[PDB]
């Protein structure tokens, strides 16, 4: 099996950390990330090795700053190429509330600050429009959903209040019943759907009415490749499912999916039964976590001393995921 690739990324201090005069307890060198314990400075710092240890603590003017472009060119680009080979792929962002999950996956729409999802979509349509072999034709379908307190909402159709039911097809696996799947023929169109979708996510008074730290966003692309040949006249089809996930903060029930995800990752890392069905998230992502798929995790890290316990936990879960191997 192909190992689930893992990258961790540390961001610059945020307003909260700055207001408390937080010092940085994270260091990086090569693919290694080291964390210092602010409370017990007497211990030896804990080190972890990953596929990538992204230092994005400073700013683009730094030669060593890990940009949106590097993060995408390493893992995003690799997964898209696998999609073209016909493999199902998945990338999920994991980490403590405010560590930088949405920035990594979505980013912002200015300044070359766009994240993995916008860059991959753009790259996808660019490659398709660069085609010169008329025997090849393509189809791109998109779906975007939110998972909040186990409830699934269609972000491309906020015009319906049904909490879509996650089901298990008797032969084809899990799916979200009646989730809209829209055909898109340009990057501009897909971006427009992405934008309105981002506008439909649940917000929380508790988060100063910002997007709720407890909702999961799953962005799916169904990429179909049709290859003709004037001969016998059969067109062959290659279908790849691209799943781009932006998880709720790692720190019918509020934290079921996240706690269950932890258990699934731990169990898989150990095994190499698994509670996939214990949560809607792990259920829908069953094949991406141990199944027929090329998967990658990007763990977001706060650099601050005040978030030591949470950051250590993220590093430890990312270390375990690194041990998972899917069967493709």
């Amino acid at each position: 099996g192909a190992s689930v690739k893992v990258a961790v990324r540390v961001r610059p201090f945020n307003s909260r950390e700055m207001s408390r005069d937080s010092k940085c307890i994270i260091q990086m060198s090569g693919s290694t990330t080291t964390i210092v314990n602010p409370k017990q400075p007497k211990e030896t710092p804990k080190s972890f090795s990953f596929d990538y240890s992204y230092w994005s603590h400073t700013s683009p003017e730094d030669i060593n700053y890990a940009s949106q472009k590097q993060v995408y060119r390493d893992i995003g680009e690799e997964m898209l190429q696998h999609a073209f080979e016909g493999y199902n792929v998945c990338i999920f962002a994991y980490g403590q509330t405010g560590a930088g999950k949405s920035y990594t996956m979505m980013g912002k729409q200015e300044k070359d600050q766009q994240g993995i999802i916008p860059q991959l979509c753009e790259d996808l349509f660019s490659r398709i429009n660069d085609t010169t072999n008329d025997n090849m034709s393509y189809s791109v379908e998109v779906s975007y959903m939110e998972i909040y307190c186990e409830r699934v909402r269609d972000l491309l159709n906020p015009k319906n209040k049904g909490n879509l039911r996650v089901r298990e097809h008797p032969l084809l696996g899990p799916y979200v019943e009646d989730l809209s799947k829209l055909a898109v023929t340009s990057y501009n169109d897909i971006q427009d759907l992405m934008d309105s979708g981002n506008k439909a996510r649940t917000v929380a008074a508790t988060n100063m009415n910002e997007t709720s730290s407890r909702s999961h966003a799953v962005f799916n692309i169904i990429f179909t490749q049709k290859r003709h040949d004037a001969e016998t006249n059969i067109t062959t089809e290659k279908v790849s499912k691209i799943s781009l996930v932006d998880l709720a903060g790692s720190e019918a029930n509020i934290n079921k999916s996240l706690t269950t995800l932890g258990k699934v990752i731990s169990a898989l890392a150990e095994m190499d039964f698994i509670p996939y069905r214990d949560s809607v998230l792990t259920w829908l992502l069953r094949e991406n976590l141990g199944g027929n798929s090329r998967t990658a995790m990007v763990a977001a890290l706060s650099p601050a001393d005040i978030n030591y316990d949470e950051t250590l936990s993220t590093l430890r879960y990312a270390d375990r995921a690194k041990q998972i191997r899917n069967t493709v």
Partner: peptide, 15 residues
């Protein structure tokens, strides 16, 4: 192999 779903709603997460 954890027993805190019960507590996991009450508000304590691996901590």
């Amino acid at each position: 192999k954890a027993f805190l779903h019960w507590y996991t709603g009450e508000g304590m997460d691996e901590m």
